[PDB]
Amino acid sequence: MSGVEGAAFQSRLPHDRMTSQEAACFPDIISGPQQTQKVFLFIRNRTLQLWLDNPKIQLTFEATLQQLEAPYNSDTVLVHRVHSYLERHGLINFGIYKRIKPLPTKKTGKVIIIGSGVSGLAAARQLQSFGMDVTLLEARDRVGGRVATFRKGNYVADLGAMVVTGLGGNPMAVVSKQVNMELAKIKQKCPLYEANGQAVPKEKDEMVEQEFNRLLEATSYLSHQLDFNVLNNKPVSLGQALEVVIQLQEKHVKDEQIEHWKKIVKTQEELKELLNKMVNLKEKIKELHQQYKEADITAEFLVKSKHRDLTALCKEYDELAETQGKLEEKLQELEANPPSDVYLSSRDRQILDWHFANLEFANATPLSTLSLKHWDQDDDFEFTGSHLTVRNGYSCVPVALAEGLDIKLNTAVRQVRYTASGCEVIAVNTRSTSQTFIYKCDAVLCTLPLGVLKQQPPAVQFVPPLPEWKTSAVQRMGFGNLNKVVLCFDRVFWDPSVNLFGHVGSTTASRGELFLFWNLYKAPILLALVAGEAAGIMENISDDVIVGRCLAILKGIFGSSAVPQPKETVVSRWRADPWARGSYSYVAAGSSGNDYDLMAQPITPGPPIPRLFFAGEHTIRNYPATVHGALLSGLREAGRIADQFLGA
Ligand SMILES: Cc1cc2nc3c(=O)[nH]c(=O)nc-3n(C[C@H](O)[C@H](O)[C@H](O)COP(=O)(O)OP(=O)(O)OC[C@H]3O[C@@H](n4cnc5c(N)ncnc54)[C@H](O)[C@@H]3O)c2cc1C
Ligand SMILES: O=CCCc1cc(F)cc(F)c1OCc1ccccc1
């Protein structure tokens, strides 16, 4: 594919037609001749290409006009329109870049942003570029939110986001170039170790995995082909459907076991009756063998008759022992080819629970909480390319984003007042909570995590309270959990050529406890994941004991002598973290992707213009629970807000 077509793809745009969004802002193009539309698209793609080819400097209108070839560089008005649209919507001149045109010194409109994670920072930089007065209020003593990098000595380790999900179409590709993230592709191989330390043999790792795929497709067939979505008044969870399809495979195994037993018994009865019938014939021949020995002309003919009759019963017998053979032959082969005894052996199921845990990792919640119909509604939006880890720590992104922003750390928002005339945010200093702050403004952008919005009683009071249609969405939606244990050693004792290895838990309930180990970093560091039901429960374990359990697993895989005591350790507790209350959102049973749209919807105080805006990973339907989705949501909101307070 070409250069300009690649730029559309990298911007998540169809290279050869206009989006609905573009059709709204450029109606004259839609109703116009086909030729002009083709010219529009080329101007849009080429502008994106100029920006994506060098995202480190601002791409100005003037510079765009100068790098277009004829006849495109001659339609100055259209070029400005396109450049302005792309800039407003954050498709060019986003992230951190050298400004050509320095910042307008008289600001226009005052926006408070709640929260200094990627969504807040991304919006903030936009709004600051559009010439507004932006202040962020962050409760932690750092920026980044759920991007949190641990650094001590040579050790670098991410406690929140750590993976970049393909660069094709990914806005983080731009930010990576801007910020100089060291990215590294993740090697796919992931050996598993049973709870006793033994490696899972390849036959089984392969067999179980393929059966995990088949099981999971069956739940999709149930949902998206049989409408198995609402059972006895309740929406079906993924975990529930998974139980169903396992139960049928178990039924299928039991039934072919029954058919086999029936085939055995039938052949045994045949042999039992045939042998008895052969028994009676030996007796019948016993009595004729006796008459033949006793034996005149009627005697001379008596012998021929007795011989003719004695050998006829031997033909009957020899012919039955022939059938005797082809039965006990058919029997012997059936006693040797039993079908499966059980669908899953005890070890097989434990290994299968690993794959389930891996999916509870990806979604941050136990499977029995996920919406069967919608849990993967975002799959059509995945980026192309291999996944990467941030070898220098993902915190480099929000820290770069924070440069030059008016960011008030240790400032926790307690109440958001919004009315038709303006807004007031009330916050306390987390170091001296008697100290209070009152921030007047024209608009509030709320990037508070869904976990904080769900908090009952509320951590942040809204005045007037949020409308029912918004609170209903917040209650319906899922906010999951996921935790990491960071182990820093003075020497690498694991396989260096492997990024991942799995610990197969002993029980289904605990299947997510320390189930996946990551080797990601220059220094000798391991990350152990705690997923599913284990995530929330493990937060109540002291660090010394949970690390002891890691070392117990690792000493089982590598030997008790090869595993030294760690020099430094860190354990996340995202659920108990008051500024997150969880890891990220998931589509809960009974929710749907539509709730992500309602989360993004701004609030207008009744009689009118909107004042309270929403960004964050829980507000972007096609990219939830990700860093880039948070980034995209901040860009989106900055465009929405600038449209309102500067003009569309
Ligand atoms: C353990 C873990 C692993 C993850 N794995 C990945 C991964 O590899 N890749 C990926 O793309 N995503 C992953 N994610 C998800 C990703 O980190 C998030 O989607 C993303 O960080 C969303 O950030 P946000 O800006 O929307 O919210 P946040 O980063 O939470 O920002 C909200 C901010 O508001 C602040 N705040 C809270 N309450 C208040 C208050 N009262 N007043 C003021 N400020 C307040 C918070 O401190 C925070 O800074 C993971 C997340 C976690 C936690
Ligand atoms: O550590 C953080 C993982 C959380 C996460 C949340 C998402 F919504 C999407 C992700 F890509 C993702 O991170 C990498 C990943 C990819 C596939 C399966 C599991 C994890």
Q: What is the CATH number of the domain that holds 95?
A: 1.10.10.10
CA–CA separation, 213 and 219 (whole Å) = 10
On whether the CB atoms of residues 588 and 477 are closer than 8 A, the answer is yes
Is 77 annotated to bind a ligand? Reply is no
Is the bond preceding 71 in cis, omega lying within 30 degrees of 0? yes
Beta bridge partners of 603: 612
535 φ, ψ (degrees, to nearest 5): -50, -60
Strand-by-strand arrangement of the 387-390 sheet:
163-165, 387-390, 183-185
Best probe residue, ligand 2, of 165, 190, 530 (max atoms within 8 Å of C-beta): 165
Provide the token pair at 265.
């018994």
Q: Is 600 in the pocket of ligand 1 (CB under 6 A)?
A: no
* Elucidation method: X-ray
Best probe residue, ligand 1, of 584, 623, 635, 637 (max atoms within 8 Å of C-beta): 584
The residue assigned the tokens 């995590």 is 449
Strands (E) located in 391-459: 406-408, 411-419, 422-429, 436-441, 443-446
Is 119 annotated to bind a ligand? Reply is yes
Q: Is 453 in the pocket of ligand 1 (CB under 6 A)?
A: no
On whether the CB atoms of residues 253 and 343 are closer than 8 A, the answer is yes
CA–CA separation, 256 and 97 (whole Å) = 66
243 Cβ neighbours under 8 A, 6+ residues apart: none
How many Cα neighbours within 13 Å face the side chain of 354?
A: 27
Cα–Cα separations (whole angstroms), residue 532 to 147, 510, 513: 20, 8, 8
Measured from the Cβ of residue 51, the count of other Cβ atoms closer than 10 Å reads 26
Letter for the amino acid at 426? Answer: I
**The ligand 2 atom nearest the CA atom of 625:** 8
Q: Which helix (H) or strand (E) holds 394?
A: none
CA–CA separation, 598 and 450 (whole Å) = 13
Q: Is 388 in the pocket of ligand 1 (CB under 6 A)?
A: no
Write b or e for each residue in 57-91: b if 16 or more Cβ atoms lie within 10 A of its Cβ, otherwise e.
ebbbbeebbeebeeebeebeebbebbbebbbbbbb
Q: Give residue 479 CA to ligand 1 midpoint distance, Å.
A: 12
Same domain flag for 299 and 354: no
Provide the token pair at 87.
């800039």
Same domain flag for 644 and 495: yes
Cα–Cα separations (whole angstroms), residue 319 to 284, 323, 329, 450, 468: 15, 7, 16, 82, 87
Write b or e for each residue in 601-640: b if 16 or more Cβ atoms lie within 10 A of its Cβ, otherwise e.
ebbeeeeeeebbbbbbbbbbbebbbbbbbbbbbbbbbbbb
Is 617 annotated to bind a ligand? Reply is yes
Same domain flag for 522 and 620: yes
Is 273 annotated to bind a ligand? Reply is no
Is 84 annotated to bind a ligand? Reply is no
Helices (H), 130-201: 171-179
On whether the CB atoms of residues 616 and 448 are closer than 8 A, the answer is yes
Provide the token pair at 252.
């299928």
Counting ligands in written order, the one closest to the CA of 425 is 1
Counting ligands in written order, the one closest to the CA of 619 is 1
CA–CA separation, 170 and 157 (whole Å) = 23
3-state SS class at 429: strand
CA–CA separation, 571 and 527 (whole Å) = 9
CA–CA separation, 286 and 18 (whole Å) = 99
100 Cβ neighbours under 8 A, 6+ residues apart: 57, 58, 60, 63
Letter for the amino acid at 531? Answer: A
> Residues 72, 76, 77, 80: what is their CA dihedral angle, to the nearest 10 degrees?
90
Out of 61, 77, 109, a domain closes at 109
Radius of gyration for the alpha carbons in the chain, expressed in angstroms and rounded: 36
Letter for the amino acid at 50? Answer: L
Helices 297-336 and 238-294 cross at an angle (nearest 10°) of 160
Instruction: List the domain range (segments joined by +) for residue 71.
Output: 2-109
The binding-site residues of ligand 2, defined as CB within 6 angstroms of any ligand atom, are 161-163, 165, 361-362, 584, 625-626
Q: Is 375 in the pocket of ligand 1 (CB under 6 A)?
A: no
CA angle 510, 219, 627 (to 5 degrees): 65
440 φ, ψ (degrees, to nearest 5): -75, 145
Q: Which helix (H) or strand (E) holds 150?
A: strand 149-152
Counting ligands in written order, the one closest to the CA of 382 is 2
Strands (E) located in 311-432: 387-390, 406-408, 411-419, 422-429
Same domain flag for 155 and 207: yes
Cα–Cα separations (whole angstroms), residue 402 to 96, 183, 200, 408: 9, 21, 46, 11
Out of 344, 359, 377, a domain closes at 344
Is 162 annotated to bind a ligand? Reply is yes
CA–CA separation, 624 and 635 (whole Å) = 14
The per-residue DSSP string of 507-574 comes to SSTTTTTT-EEE--SSSSEEEEEE-THHHHHHTTS-HHHHHHHHHHHHHHHH-TTT-PPPSEEEE--T
Same domain flag for 359 and 404: yes
How many Cα neighbours within 13 Å face the side chain of 556?
A: 18
- The residue nearest atom 13 of ligand 2, judged by CA position, is 163
Sign of CA dihedral 559, 560, 566, 570: positive
Beta bridge partners of 133: 110
Read off the CATH number of the domain in which 314 is found. Answer: 1.10.287.80
Letter for the amino acid at 35? Answer: Q
> Residues 196, 197, 198, 201: what is their CA dihedral angle, to the nearest 10 degrees?
110
626 φ, ψ (degrees, to nearest 5): -125, 165
Strands (E) located in 442-519: 443-446, 461-463, 478-479, 483-488, 500-504, 516-518
Measured from the Cβ of residue 255, the count of other Cβ atoms closer than 10 Å reads 11
Counting ligands in written order, the one closest to the CA of 630 is 1
Same domain flag for 229 and 281: no
CA angle 429, 430, 434 (to 5 degrees): 55
Q: Give residue 170 CA to ligand 2 midpoint distance, Å.
A: 14
3-state SS class at 70: coil
Same domain flag for 13 and 30: yes
CA–CA separation, 530 and 551 (whole Å) = 15
CA–CA separation, 500 and 188 (whole Å) = 8
The size of the chain, in residues, is: 648
Counting ligands in written order, the one closest to the CA of 483 is 1
DSSP character at residue 74: G
> Residues 406, 120, 92, 86: what is their CA dihedral angle, to the nearest 10 degrees?
-110
**The ligand 1 atom nearest the CA atom of 574:** 53
CA–CA separation, 597 and 125 (whole Å) = 23
Same domain flag for 86 and 125: no
CA–CA separation, 597 and 24 (whole Å) = 19
Give the per-residue SS3 of 589-629: CCCCHHHHHHHHCCECCCCCCCCEEECCHHHCCCCCCCHHH
Q: Is 547 in the pocket of ligand 1 (CB under 6 A)?
A: no
620: alpha, beta or left, given left = phi > 0 and alpha = psi -120 to 50? beta
Beta bridge partners of 155: 152
Q: Is 139 in the pocket of ligand 1 (CB under 6 A)?
A: yes
Nominal resolution in Å? 2.6
- The residue nearest atom 38 of ligand 1, judged by CA position, is 579
For the chain, how many structural domains are there in total? 3
Q: Is 536 in the pocket of ligand 1 (CB under 6 A)?
A: no
Provide the token pair at 502.
């799995």
Same domain flag for 116 and 194: yes
Same domain flag for 421 and 541: yes
The residue assigned the tokens 């951190």 is 96
Residue 291's closest CA among 277, 313, 309?
Answer: 309
Is 417 annotated to bind a ligand? Reply is no
Same domain flag for 156 and 242: no
Best probe residue, ligand 1, of 146, 170, 431, 446 (max atoms within 8 Å of C-beta): 146
Q: Is 527 in the pocket of ligand 1 (CB under 6 A)?
A: no
**The ligand 2 atom nearest the CA atom of 484:** 1
CA–CA separation, 137 and 408 (whole Å) = 5
CA–CA separation, 279 and 256 (whole Å) = 34
Breaks (C-N over 2.5 A) in the chain follow: 295, 607
> Residues 564, 393, 629, 498: what is their CA dihedral angle, to the nearest 10 degrees?
-40
Measured from the Cβ of residue 38, the count of other Cβ atoms closer than 10 Å reads 11
The per-residue DSSP string of 208-239 comes to HHHHHHHHHHHHHHHHHHH---EETTEEPBHH
443-446 and 612-614 beta bridge pairing:
parallel
**The ligand 2 atom nearest the CA atom of 361:** 19
Out of 41, 74, 109, a domain closes at 109
Same domain flag for 131 and 74: no
